[PDB]
Amino acid sequence: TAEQVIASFRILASDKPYILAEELRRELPPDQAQYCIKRMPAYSGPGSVPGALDYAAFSSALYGE
């Protein structure tokens, strides 16, 4: 489900509301990391930093949620 995927991304982001490209590269195989980096939109919500990626927007859109 989208809930499980978002929660898993959040875990790899150390519970931040966004994830960074370097965290995807550390935690995921390279092609999986790049697939996500290419398709995650910029996070602009609370606590955003430059390079913040919106894993929640990506995951919700993927499953039509």
Binding site: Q4, V5, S8, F9, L12, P29, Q32, Y35, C36
Partner: protein, 308 residues
């Protein structure tokens, strides 16, 4: 034709996404009793895939043990085969460890004791599981302290006594034994290697062999190149490290057996040997371990749908 499942059971939500089968919860309507239905669509299966389905059904019927999922019924309809199991409701072991927050060596020892008893039973019935991995370790219920149940005999094979043979490449890379990776004849010890990998993860929350390059992974496994690094392993009892060492022995003939491991002091004298210290870093790591596993499956599926 037979429509006994269709007539007597109702199907509900999916419980497990398999490669060529699905597990859904079902209810036997007359009794009101819930079960799990493992469903294979047999319409376009090869002769070899039929044989493997029939092998799994046979093995599931053969195995009766408190720490093995129990087959309730088996139903063949025109285009589908149903293996109906007693429903276990506690979910995956590794998810429960994270959810319940606190975990010690004593907890891991009680867990792996149950797994070893299940594996011993399989081996005593002439069955090698070949797929011991976290997804196949379930909990009987959400009851605190619920029994561990070994699940999913899709890869299991029948052996004859102690005879070793090349039964093929099958299993999940991080859990494969050196003898399989060397394409050597193999048998029961492959399950004990996988048990050692699982036990290592139960203690520190990350796997002993890992590498993005699967070829490098397999060289590391074949070399037995794992480590007990500081600081997390500094608090692990010598007896726990000893049991891991004896399971992760690259020579299968010298590797500890299930019966022998059940007699190992960290298992058989858990109350006085296993540490009761909560291992926070283990649970922390396990949380990331489970997340990587989920995302691997989700992202690989998304990538596959992109290639089209």
């Amino acid at each position: 034709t037979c429509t006994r499942f269709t007539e007597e059971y109702q199907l509900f939500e999916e419980l497990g996404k398999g490669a060529f089968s699905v597990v859904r919860r079902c209810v036997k309507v007359l009794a009101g009793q819930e079960y799990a239905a493992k469903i294979i669509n047999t319409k376009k299966l090869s002769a070899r895939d039929h044989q493997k389905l029939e092998r799994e059904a046979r093995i599931c019927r053969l195995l009766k043990h408190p720490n093995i999922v129990r087959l309730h019924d088996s139903i063949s309809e025109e285009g589908h085969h149903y293996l109906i199991f007693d429903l276990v409701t506690g979910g995956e072991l590794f998810e429960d460890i994270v959810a319940r927050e606190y975990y010690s060596e004593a907890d891991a020892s009680h867990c792996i004791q149950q797994i070893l008893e299940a594996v011993l039973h399989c081996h005593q019935m002439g069955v090698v599981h070949r797929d011991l991995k976290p997804e196949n370790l379930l909990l009987a219920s959400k009851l605190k302290g619920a029994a561990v149940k070994l699940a999913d005999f899709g890869l299991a094979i029948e052996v004859e006594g102690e005879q070793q043979a090349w039964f093929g490449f099958a299993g999940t890379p991080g859990y494969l034994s050196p003898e399989v990776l060397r394409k050597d004849p193999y048998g029961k010890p492959v399950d004990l290697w996988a048990c050692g990998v699982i036990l290592y993860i139960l203690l520190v929350g990350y796997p002993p062999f890992w590498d993005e390059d699967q070829h490098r992974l397999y060289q590391q496994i074949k070399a037995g190149a794992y480590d007990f690094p500081s600081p997390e392993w500094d608090t692990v009892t010598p007896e726990a490290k000893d049991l891991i060492n004896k399971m992760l022995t690259i020579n299968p003939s010298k590797r500890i057996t299930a019966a022998e491991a059940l007699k190992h002091p960290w298992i058989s004298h858990r109350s006085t040997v296993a540490s009761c210290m909560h291992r926070q870093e283990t649970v922390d790591c396990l949380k990331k371990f489970n997340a990587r596993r989920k995302l691997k499956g989700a992202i690989l599926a998304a990538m596959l749908a992109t290639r089209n």
